């Protein structure tokens, strides 16, 4: 037996906010910024350049057609909250 799917890594560097996904690189990976899917965005790392507390904030879902565990991720500032 092996260990499953880990959890998100939110790194922030002034202008930008990086988003290391819990999954693998897979290429077939889908990124979803709250219902609305992300246009051909595919690596485990998402760089939300010049982040806005209204525009770039929200619910995030990284999923492959494998780990459809559909593991959310909240944002703005306090990640994984109400």
């Amino acid at each position, epitope marked *: 037996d*092996d260990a*499953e799917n880990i959890e998100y890594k939110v790194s922030i560097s002034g202008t930008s906010v990086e988003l290391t996904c819990p999954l693998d*690189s897979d290429e077939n990976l889908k990124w979803e910024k709250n219902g609305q899917e992300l246009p051909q965005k595919h690596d485990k790392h998402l760089v939300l350049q010049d982040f806005s507390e209204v525009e770039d904030s929200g619910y995030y879902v990284c999923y492959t057609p*494998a*780990s*459809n565990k559909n593991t959310y991720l909240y944002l703005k500032a306090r990640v994984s909250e109400y």
Partner: antibody, heavy 116, light 108 residues
Framework: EVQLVESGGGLVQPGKSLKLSCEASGFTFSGYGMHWVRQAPGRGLESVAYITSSSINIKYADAVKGRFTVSRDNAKNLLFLQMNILKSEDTAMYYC?????????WGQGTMVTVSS | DIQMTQSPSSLPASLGDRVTINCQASQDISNYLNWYQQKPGKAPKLLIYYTNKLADGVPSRFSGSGSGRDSSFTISSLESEDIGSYYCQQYYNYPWTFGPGTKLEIKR
């Protein structure tokens, strides 16, 4: 264009061993999660194992969980299935596959038969 | 680990008629359901992905329907080449649980 080739199946006696080896062609295999699927005659279709692009997460179907072990070589674009302690349940045809969201890549498959 | 119910497991039908196949899972699959056309010895072709969504170069007539814990599939008007096994499969969790296997029998 996106050709896949399952290699080395055939007969085996019970509780033995077998290494199945798919070959990728026409894609960035290196960074694509892969599946191993079987069609157990009569009994129908079954998913066997899944291994991520970087081999970080491996997922097995309950029936084989244990005795079977998927692996990959991203240089020679090879997907291997390491079946051991074989049963008559494990008597099926095996295909290796790339499962996209809209696409589906299956190989020709190799027929594995387990009888004493 | 989910489970699929296909009804019927033999559908003898005349040509060019509303052929309907039904799929049913244990718990919710949330539309992550596929349909396939396995003809003769070799590999199953994908027809419909995410239930509603029709795949690339699949005849207009084929219609993937049903949601939640259930689903269906419908060849609008069964043509000559559509003869062979049909499978539903789910993609909500690994292992992908596969359907039994409906076989299309051409009524002559």
């Amino acid at each position: 264009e996106v050709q896949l080739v399952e290699s080395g199946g055939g007969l085996v006696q019970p509780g033995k061993s077998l290494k199945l080896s798919c070959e990728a062609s026409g894609f960035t295999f290196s960074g694509y999660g892969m599946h191993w699927v079987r069609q157990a005659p009569g009994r129908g279709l079954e998913s066997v194992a899944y291994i991520t692009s970087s081999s970080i997460n491996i997922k097995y179907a309950d029936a084989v969980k244990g005795r079977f072990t998927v692996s990959r070589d991203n240089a020679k674009n090879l997907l291997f299935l390491q079946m051991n302690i074989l049963k008559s349940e494990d008597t099926a045809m095996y295909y290796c596959a790339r499962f996209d969201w809209d696409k589906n890549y299956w190989g020709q498959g190799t027929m594995v038969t387990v009888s004493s | 680990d989910i489970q699929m119910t296909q009804s019927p497991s033999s559908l003898p039908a005349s040509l060019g008629d509303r052929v309907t196949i039904n799929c049913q899972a244990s718990q919710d699959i949330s539309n992550y359901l596929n349909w396939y056309q396995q003809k003769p010895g070799k590999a199953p072709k994908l027809l419909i992905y995410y239930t509603n969504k029709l795949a690339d170069g699949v005849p207009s007539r084929f219609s993937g329907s049903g949601s939640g814990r259930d689903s269906s599939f419908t060849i609008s008007s069964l043509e000559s080449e559509d003869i062979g096994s049909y499978y539903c499969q789910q993609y909500y969790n690994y292992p992908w649980t596969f359907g039994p296997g409906t076989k299309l029998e051409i009524k002559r």
